[PDB]
Amino acid sequence: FCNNLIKELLKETRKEHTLRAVQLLYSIFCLDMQQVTLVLLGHILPGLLTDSSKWHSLMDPPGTALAKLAVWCALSSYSSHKGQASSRQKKRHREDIEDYVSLNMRDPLNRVLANLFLLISSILGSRTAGPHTQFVQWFMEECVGCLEQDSRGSILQFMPFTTVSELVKVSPKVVLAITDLSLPLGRQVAAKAIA
Amino acid sequence: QPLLDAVLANIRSPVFNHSLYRTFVPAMMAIHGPPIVSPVVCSRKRRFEEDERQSIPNVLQGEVARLDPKFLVNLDPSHCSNNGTVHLICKLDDKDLPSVPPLELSVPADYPAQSPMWIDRQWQYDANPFLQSVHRCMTSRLLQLPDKHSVTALLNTWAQSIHQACL
Amino acid sequence: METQLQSIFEEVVKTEIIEEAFPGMFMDTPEDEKTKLISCLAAFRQFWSGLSQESHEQCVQWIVKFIHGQHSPKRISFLYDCLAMAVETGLLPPRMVCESLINSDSLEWERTQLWALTFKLVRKIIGGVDYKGVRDLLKAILEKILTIPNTVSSAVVQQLLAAREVIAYILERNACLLPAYFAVTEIRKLYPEGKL
Amino acid sequence: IGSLSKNKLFIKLTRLPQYYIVVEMLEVPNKPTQLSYNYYFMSVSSPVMALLLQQFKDNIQDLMSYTKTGCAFNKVLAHFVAMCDTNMPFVGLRLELSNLEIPHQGVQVEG
């Protein structure tokens, strides 16, 4: 469903139409927010970033809408949501571990978001970036938003700090994102953002 | 002189080159009959693993690591971590006055690279007249370098200019 | 003789000397920012006043060819300073140098440093007082950018981005610099009613 | 250009690649002696007419004597006729290595 949707999406070739498209699409994704957003964050983003065949699509200005789409659905999912419908509660019993290798809880949405962010940081690596550098740029840009609470950024041995350090080479945007709770961990990224 | 055999032997150019066997290997087997040509253990293994995974071709690091202890080379935030991997920060430590480190961002190993770009040129150089003269002598000597070589020529010329600063 | 002029310019600019093995301090102390640049400018202006004013298109082509025949980014920048000074002196109007430089020496993603310095020159000369006949150079620039591949690299991004900076400056000053309609129509080589 | 001068040469580097004509700055101001021993280097051979510029420390080499840590001043002169004896060969090698790859010349191992 979402695959064919995003496939039909990249045809406008004009920012306004793509904007209206993603605007209507965020709404059409309602009534199934949890599972739809899970499947999206799990497949549709790696489905283009992991390989080069689908990289061709990511170069489009629709890519900015796709980034906006991703951050919007992530924010909506992380936010409080009951979503209890008859045709949904009667069909909300499956099994999935997501095989999310770890090399503040155990929740499918949170784990999928962590895996997604890890893959973002990995794609942010060097030695190849034609289309996806702009993708992660737009992602980080649209992620910046007031009244938001996503991008928790665990601070044990994780990428987000090095990720922000690298994104600084593409000024104070990440200087605000990484500042989770003014913890001593944030002192490092603050010093790096001092420049 | 005995070239009659040459062209007629060269006649057998096309793909069906098997009859040569029936022409030579019996007579060969008369004189040379060796079963022991390569009986030792032998097997073809094309590749096992091949990648740098740490930096550019080794030659640059291998050569720069051989420099004097008077120079102190390090790396800035990795904005070209894999392909470029060249933006050096150096600290002259000797019997001379210290100064600002250079940029030193090079190109592929062909080395048509005047690597330093002086990212902090303006404000760091407008500070004092002495270091301004140092910079002037630096750029004047760099212009004199014909096809400069980032590996050694850059740091050597910079050290020479820093040692020329004492007038 | 254009070759004689090139050799004279080389002698005036190239000053190759001994290996400087013997350490000598007081040998060469010229003010390159005000003395050598002005001397080169004066010599080139005398040669310009000599002859071939209108026909100086092929002459400037020869000049830029000789400039890009080198391999020292520092030397290229030093030469570019003299070109800028000549612009302020009035010689080499922006149209000529812009139309010549963009072709035959772009070296697409070949010499990153050269690419960057050339586009820095374009950004500097972006003033370029010119009539409605200015869209041609924009079209040629975009055409030269389009030849760039899709996955060239990840390290050299900022240096190549200078082209994007020039385009941004142009299309943003278009609010006050050049006609918008012409800028839009120049995208015909890339915009057939929308083709990614 | 100058006046009555002297000249020295060498063999150890090559037969006669570059001579060395030198002359003291005669007629010192208010001094019957101490002609300050001016120095100038040349690089003619086929006698070339390229620049000479006195590429070495001419004539601040005197201040190089004061750069030491401690009856005749001859100590300076030999230096010149010494340094060429080991300097001019190496650059020639550069011209030979200027054809294969990496002509990184003039490097000094640890001083």
JSON list of C-alpha atoms in Angstrom, two decimals, chain D:
[
{"chain": "D", "resi": 1, "resn": "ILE", "atom": "CA", "xyz": [78.86, 44.24, -13.22]},
{"chain": "D", "resi": 2, "resn": "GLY", "atom": "CA", "xyz": [81.55, 45.73, -11.00]},
{"chain": "D", "resi": 3, "resn": "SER", "atom": "CA", "xyz": [85.32, 46.23, -10.98]},
{"chain": "D", "resi": 4, "resn": "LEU", "atom": "CA", "xyz": [88.59, 44.29, -10.74]},
{"chain": "D", "resi": 5, "resn": "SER", "atom": "CA", "xyz": [87.44, 41.04, -9.16]},
{"chain": "D", "resi": 6, "resn": "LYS", "atom": "CA", "xyz": [88.45, 37.44, -8.52]},
{"chain": "D", "resi": 7, "resn": "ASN", "atom": "CA", "xyz": [86.87, 34.09, -9.32]},
{"chain": "D", "resi": 8, "resn": "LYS", "atom": "CA", "xyz": [86.96, 30.49, -8.09]},
{"chain": "D", "resi": 9, "resn": "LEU", "atom": "CA", "xyz": [85.60, 27.27, -9.56]},
{"chain": "D", "resi": 10, "resn": "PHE", "atom": "CA", "xyz": [85.31, 23.59, -8.58]},
{"chain": "D", "resi": 11, "resn": "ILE", "atom": "CA", "xyz": [85.60, 20.06, -9.97]},
{"chain": "D", "resi": 12, "resn": "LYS", "atom": "CA", "xyz": [84.00, 17.80, -7.36]},
{"chain": "D", "resi": 13, "resn": "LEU", "atom": "CA", "xyz": [80.45, 18.78, -8.32]},
{"chain": "D", "resi": 14, "resn": "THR", "atom": "CA", "xyz": [81.11, 18.90, -12.07]},
{"chain": "D", "resi": 15, "resn": "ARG", "atom": "CA", "xyz": [83.68, 20.05, -14.61]},
{"chain": "D", "resi": 16, "resn": "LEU", "atom": "CA", "xyz": [82.45, 23.65, -15.03]},
{"chain": "D", "resi": 17, "resn": "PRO", "atom": "CA", "xyz": [78.68, 23.95, -14.55]},
{"chain": "D", "resi": 18, "resn": "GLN", "atom": "CA", "xyz": [78.80, 27.31, -12.75]},
{"chain": "D", "resi": 19, "resn": "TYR", "atom": "CA", "xyz": [81.81, 29.49, -11.93]},
{"chain": "D", "resi": 20, "resn": "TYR", "atom": "CA", "xyz": [81.92, 31.76, -8.87]},
{"chain": "D", "resi": 21, "resn": "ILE", "atom": "CA", "xyz": [83.06, 35.35, -9.43]},
{"chain": "D", "resi": 22, "resn": "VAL", "atom": "CA", "xyz": [83.44, 37.34, -6.21]},
{"chain": "D", "resi": 23, "resn": "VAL", "atom": "CA", "xyz": [84.74, 40.81, -5.34]},
{"chain": "D", "resi": 24, "resn": "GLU", "atom": "CA", "xyz": [85.06, 42.77, -2.13]},
{"chain": "D", "resi": 25, "resn": "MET", "atom": "CA", "xyz": [83.23, 46.09, -1.87]},
{"chain": "D", "resi": 26, "resn": "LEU", "atom": "CA", "xyz": [86.31, 48.24, -2.42]},
{"chain": "D", "resi": 27, "resn": "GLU", "atom": "CA", "xyz": [86.54, 51.86, -1.25]},
{"chain": "D", "resi": 28, "resn": "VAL", "atom": "CA", "xyz": [84.84, 51.30, 2.11]},
{"chain": "D", "resi": 29, "resn": "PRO", "atom": "CA", "xyz": [83.41, 54.53, 3.60]},
{"chain": "D", "resi": 30, "resn": "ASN", "atom": "CA", "xyz": [85.99, 56.11, 5.92]},
{"chain": "D", "resi": 31, "resn": "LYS", "atom": "CA", "xyz": [87.92, 52.86, 6.20]},
{"chain": "D", "resi": 32, "resn": "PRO", "atom": "CA", "xyz": [91.24, 52.00, 4.51]},
{"chain": "D", "resi": 33, "resn": "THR", "atom": "CA", "xyz": [90.46, 48.34, 5.24]},
{"chain": "D", "resi": 34, "resn": "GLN", "atom": "CA", "xyz": [87.43, 46.09, 5.72]},
{"chain": "D", "resi": 35, "resn": "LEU", "atom": "CA", "xyz": [86.02, 46.07, 2.17]},
{"chain": "D", "resi": 36, "resn": "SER", "atom": "CA", "xyz": [83.08, 44.00, 3.51]},
{"chain": "D", "resi": 37, "resn": "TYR", "atom": "CA", "xyz": [83.81, 41.22, 0.96]},
{"chain": "D", "resi": 38, "resn": "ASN", "atom": "CA", "xyz": [80.69, 41.41, -1.18]},
{"chain": "D", "resi": 39, "resn": "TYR", "atom": "CA", "xyz": [79.52, 38.09, -2.65]},
{"chain": "D", "resi": 40, "resn": "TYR", "atom": "CA", "xyz": [77.57, 37.27, -5.82]},
{"chain": "D", "resi": 41, "resn": "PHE", "atom": "CA", "xyz": [76.66, 33.95, -7.43]},
{"chain": "D", "resi": 42, "resn": "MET", "atom": "CA", "xyz": [76.18, 33.22, -11.13]},
{"chain": "D", "resi": 43, "resn": "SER", "atom": "CA", "xyz": [74.68, 30.31, -13.05]},
{"chain": "D", "resi": 44, "resn": "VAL", "atom": "CA", "xyz": [76.05, 30.67, -16.58]},
{"chain": "D", "resi": 45, "resn": "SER", "atom": "CA", "xyz": [77.52, 27.72, -18.48]},
{"chain": "D", "resi": 46, "resn": "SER", "atom": "CA", "xyz": [76.97, 27.56, -23.56]},
{"chain": "D", "resi": 47, "resn": "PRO", "atom": "CA", "xyz": [76.97, 30.66, -21.33]},
{"chain": "D", "resi": 48, "resn": "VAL", "atom": "CA", "xyz": [73.37, 31.13, -20.20]},
{"chain": "D", "resi": 49, "resn": "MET", "atom": "CA", "xyz": [71.90, 34.57, -19.51]},
{"chain": "D", "resi": 50, "resn": "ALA", "atom": "CA", "xyz": [69.35, 33.56, -16.87]},
{"chain": "D", "resi": 51, "resn": "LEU", "atom": "CA", "xyz": [68.88, 35.48, -13.63]},
{"chain": "D", "resi": 52, "resn": "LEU", "atom": "CA", "xyz": [71.46, 35.14, -10.86]},
{"chain": "D", "resi": 53, "resn": "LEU", "atom": "CA", "xyz": [69.92, 37.46, -8.23]},
{"chain": "D", "resi": 54, "resn": "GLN", "atom": "CA", "xyz": [72.57, 36.32, -5.74]},
{"chain": "D", "resi": 55, "resn": "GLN", "atom": "CA", "xyz": [70.09, 33.64, -4.69]},
{"chain": "D", "resi": 56, "resn": "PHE", "atom": "CA", "xyz": [72.00, 32.87, -1.47]},
{"chain": "D", "resi": 57, "resn": "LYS", "atom": "CA", "xyz": [72.16, 35.02, 1.67]},
{"chain": "D", "resi": 58, "resn": "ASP", "atom": "CA", "xyz": [74.11, 37.71, -0.22]},
{"chain": "D", "resi": 59, "resn": "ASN", "atom": "CA", "xyz": [74.92, 39.74, 1.53]},
{"chain": "D", "resi": 60, "resn": "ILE", "atom": "CA", "xyz": [73.23, 39.11, 4.88]},
{"chain": "D", "resi": 61, "resn": "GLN", "atom": "CA", "xyz": [75.59, 36.14, 5.29]},
{"chain": "D", "resi": 62, "resn": "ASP", "atom": "CA", "xyz": [77.55, 38.33, 7.71]},
{"chain": "D", "resi": 63, "resn": "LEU", "atom": "CA", "xyz": [74.55, 38.26, 10.04]},
{"chain": "D", "resi": 64, "resn": "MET", "atom": "CA", "xyz": [74.64, 34.47, 9.63]},
{"chain": "D", "resi": 65, "resn": "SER", "atom": "CA", "xyz": [78.04, 34.54, 11.36]},
{"chain": "D", "resi": 66, "resn": "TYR", "atom": "CA", "xyz": [76.46, 36.28, 14.35]},
{"chain": "D", "resi": 67, "resn": "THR", "atom": "CA", "xyz": [73.86, 33.48, 14.46]},
{"chain": "D", "resi": 68, "resn": "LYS", "atom": "CA", "xyz": [76.36, 31.20, 16.24]},
{"chain": "D", "resi": 69, "resn": "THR", "atom": "CA", "xyz": [76.37, 30.22, 19.92]},
{"chain": "D", "resi": 70, "resn": "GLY", "atom": "CA", "xyz": [79.92, 31.40, 20.68]},
{"chain": "D", "resi": 71, "resn": "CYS", "atom": "CA", "xyz": [91.72, 35.77, 14.61]},
{"chain": "D", "resi": 72, "resn": "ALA", "atom": "CA", "xyz": [90.50, 35.47, 11.01]},
{"chain": "D", "resi": 73, "resn": "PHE", "atom": "CA", "xyz": [86.99, 35.69, 9.55]},
{"chain": "D", "resi": 74, "resn": "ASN", "atom": "CA", "xyz": [87.93, 33.18, 6.80]},
{"chain": "D", "resi": 75, "resn": "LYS", "atom": "CA", "xyz": [85.40, 30.86, 8.48]},
{"chain": "D", "resi": 76, "resn": "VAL", "atom": "CA", "xyz": [82.65, 32.38, 6.36]},
{"chain": "D", "resi": 77, "resn": "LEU", "atom": "CA", "xyz": [84.32, 32.17, 2.94]},
{"chain": "D", "resi": 78, "resn": "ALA", "atom": "CA", "xyz": [84.95, 28.41, 2.97]},
{"chain": "D", "resi": 79, "resn": "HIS", "atom": "CA", "xyz": [81.24, 27.89, 3.74]},
{"chain": "D", "resi": 80, "resn": "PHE", "atom": "CA", "xyz": [80.27, 29.17, 0.30]},
{"chain": "D", "resi": 81, "resn": "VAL", "atom": "CA", "xyz": [82.95, 27.23, -1.57]},
{"chain": "D", "resi": 82, "resn": "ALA", "atom": "CA", "xyz": [81.92, 24.36, 0.69]},
{"chain": "D", "resi": 83, "resn": "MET", "atom": "CA", "xyz": [78.14, 24.39, 0.33]},
{"chain": "D", "resi": 84, "resn": "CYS", "atom": "CA", "xyz": [78.11, 24.40, -3.48]},
{"chain": "D", "resi": 85, "resn": "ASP", "atom": "CA", "xyz": [80.40, 21.35, -3.32]},
{"chain": "D", "resi": 86, "resn": "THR", "atom": "CA", "xyz": [77.44, 19.45, -1.85]},
{"chain": "D", "resi": 87, "resn": "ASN", "atom": "CA", "xyz": [74.45, 21.53, -3.00]},
{"chain": "D", "resi": 88, "resn": "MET", "atom": "CA", "xyz": [74.72, 21.80, -6.79]},
{"chain": "D", "resi": 89, "resn": "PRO", "atom": "CA", "xyz": [74.92, 18.01, -7.45]},
{"chain": "D", "resi": 90, "resn": "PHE", "atom": "CA", "xyz": [71.60, 17.18, -5.80]},
{"chain": "D", "resi": 91, "resn": "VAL", "atom": "CA", "xyz": [69.45, 19.60, -7.82]},
{"chain": "D", "resi": 92, "resn": "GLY", "atom": "CA", "xyz": [70.92, 18.05, -10.97]},
{"chain": "D", "resi": 93, "resn": "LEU", "atom": "CA", "xyz": [69.58, 14.69, -9.82]},
{"chain": "D", "resi": 94, "resn": "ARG", "atom": "CA", "xyz": [66.19, 16.41, -9.59]},
{"chain": "D", "resi": 95, "resn": "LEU", "atom": "CA", "xyz": [66.36, 17.16, -13.32]},
{"chain": "D", "resi": 96, "resn": "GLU", "atom": "CA", "xyz": [66.89, 13.44, -13.88]},
{"chain": "D", "resi": 97, "resn": "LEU", "atom": "CA", "xyz": [64.08, 12.51, -11.47]},
{"chain": "D", "resi": 98, "resn": "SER", "atom": "CA", "xyz": [61.92, 15.21, -13.06]},
{"chain": "D", "resi": 99, "resn": "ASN", "atom": "CA", "xyz": [60.96, 12.63, -15.69]},
{"chain": "D", "resi": 100, "resn": "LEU", "atom": "CA", "xyz": [59.80, 9.49, -13.81]},
{"chain": "D", "resi": 101, "resn": "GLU", "atom": "CA", "xyz": [57.71, 10.69, -10.84]},
{"chain": "D", "resi": 102, "resn": "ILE", "atom": "CA", "xyz": [57.71, 12.65, -7.57]},
{"chain": "D", "resi": 103, "resn": "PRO", "atom": "CA", "xyz": [60.66, 15.07, -7.89]},
{"chain": "D", "resi": 104, "resn": "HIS", "atom": "CA", "xyz": [60.39, 16.03, -4.20]},
{"chain": "D", "resi": 105, "resn": "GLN", "atom": "CA", "xyz": [63.80, 17.62, -3.79]},
{"chain": "D", "resi": 106, "resn": "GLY", "atom": "CA", "xyz": [65.48, 19.73, -1.13]},
{"chain": "D", "resi": 107, "resn": "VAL", "atom": "CA", "xyz": [64.22, 17.71, 1.83]},
{"chain": "D", "resi": 108, "resn": "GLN", "atom": "CA", "xyz": [66.45, 17.67, 4.93]},
{"chain": "D", "resi": 109, "resn": "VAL", "atom": "CA", "xyz": [66.44, 14.58, 7.15]},
{"chain": "D", "resi": 110, "resn": "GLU", "atom": "CA", "xyz": [65.97, 15.78, 10.77]},
{"chain": "D", "resi": 111, "resn": "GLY", "atom": "CA", "xyz": [68.58, 18.52, 10.30]}
]
